């Protein structure tokens, strides 16, 4: 797919530090556009992207209302989950939720999704049919029964297919100058000043948006996992990201190797030696 | 725009 809209929720209990904290964050791809934090004295939804600032005070009061409601809902949910697991008021617990809509290159709905976790572990997730739930345990089965009586799946499917897609298209249009613009990486091969028999080959990529990239090192055949140092895609501070790949060569016959890139911002994949 | 149905677990 080309573009996606996602909302990230965190509800955290904290004995001795006040009432449970609720944080809600909205993203269009890798760009944050909305933030709500219940920890403020008078909490309200905040704009986090320039293209969202144009939205009227009605949009902001509607966002503030559901996030104020969710603060209260998740407080009760943490209390109910403590009960299902026979946990006392002593410990700190976290409920996490991630939901959203994925649009294909055509700009149509490819995938609608929703997943919830408890203490960093899968709890309840909406199925691919968007009509049923997968409950990870017996506690999540009690949540499922409540959510079935409340008609959550029907109203969530309708939102994911309708309003989610509709509003993501509005955001993509309003933010077209920064969101529908994909920057390509600056590629180069290097080698660090090492000692004897400690030589290595390092492939680099340094300036890109989106973060999706594929760096592979193969020339004669296909080594794959066989001695290929993979590094996690690390951010820069704007929209920029970074990534590198390595292969061991403790002697001197390294012209027989080739690095390959796959970023979508480039016209076609590059070959590096 | 977020999901506008808040349901207790």
């Amino acid at each position, epitope marked *: 797919g080309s573009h996606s809209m996602r909302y990230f929720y965190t509800a955290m209990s904290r004995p001795g530090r006040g009432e449970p904290r609720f944080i809600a964050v909205g993203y269009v791809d890798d760009t944050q556009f909305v933030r709500f934090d219940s920890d403020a004295a008078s909490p309200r939804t905040e704009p986090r992207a320039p293209w969202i600032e144009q939205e009227g005070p009605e949009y902001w009061d*509607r966002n503030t*209302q*559901i996030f*104020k*409601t969710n603060t*209260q*809902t998740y*407080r*009760e949910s943490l209390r109910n989950l403590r009960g299902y697991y026979n946990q006392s008021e002593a410990g700190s617990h976290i409920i996490q939720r991630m939901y959203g809509c994925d649009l294909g290159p055509d700009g149509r709905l490819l995938r609608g999704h929703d997943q919830s976790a408890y203490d960093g572990k899968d709890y309840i997730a909406l199925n691919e049919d968007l009509s049923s739930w997968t409950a990870a345990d017996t506690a999540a089965q009690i949540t499922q029964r*409540k*959510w079935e*009586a*409340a*008609r959550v799946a*029907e*109203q969530l*499917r*309708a939102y994911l297919e309708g*309003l989610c897609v509709e509003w993501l298209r509005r955001y993509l249009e309003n933010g077209k100058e920064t969101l529908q613009r994909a920057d390509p990486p600056k590629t180069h091969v290097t080698h660090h000043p090492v000692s004897d028999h400690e030589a290595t080959l390092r492939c680099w990529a340094l300036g890109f948006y989106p973060a999706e990239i594929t760096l592979t090192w193969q020339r004669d055949g296909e080594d794959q996992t066989q001695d290929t140092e993979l590094v996690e895609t690390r951010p820069a501070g704007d929209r920029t990201f970074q990534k590198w790949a390595a292969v061991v060569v403790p002697s001197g016959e390294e012209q027989r190797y080739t690095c390959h890139v796959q970023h979508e911002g480039l016209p076609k994949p590059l070959t590096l030696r | *725009l977020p999901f*506008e*149905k*808040s*349901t*207790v677990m």
Partner: T-cell receptor
Amino acid sequence: GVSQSPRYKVAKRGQDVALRCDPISGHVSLFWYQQALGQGPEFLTYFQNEAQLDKSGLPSDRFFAERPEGSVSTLKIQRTQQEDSAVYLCASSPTGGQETQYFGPGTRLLVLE
Amino acid sequence: QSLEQPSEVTAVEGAIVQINCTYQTSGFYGLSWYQQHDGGAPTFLSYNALDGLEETGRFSSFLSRSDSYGYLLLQELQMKDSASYFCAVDTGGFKTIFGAGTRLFVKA
């Protein structure tokens, strides 16, 4: 089911009135509605447990709603006026908004000079 | 952010009656139906979130989100069916908008 008291009430203009609602046990959501003759219920206030999340529908600041323990709710009207004359309905939903609503029989309030 | 339904409808015992409800909203979440007897509590009949037909005994309710309308169909009408029927629109959050109501008169 949801219970309400008193079923009927006649009040003198300027006197205070207290309307009681006892919703279904365990129901998280509580609603208060005003119903005028030949019309549908109009939203007054919303609760989830003890927290009053919205009171945008209250006609005056003379109206005060409470649900201190997150169960029984009271709708208090200070210095009652003739315009306050209506049927006051309370409702409950098991786990939140946009759900099936369970209503009480209401309080039919009439305020006279 | 509104909805419309007929003011009154008269039908004979044993017959059928359809109450139509049209709404206008930008963020629809559900259409529901409630029956209220004079000086009584409104009681839940049916709820339509997605497009389709909800069937509960003699009563049924339909929804067409693209055409912004729904209806309640009462079959094998009885004397006890004489009441006010309210259609209700949910538009996200918790604040439900109820229609003015349709008073049904069942003739013996």
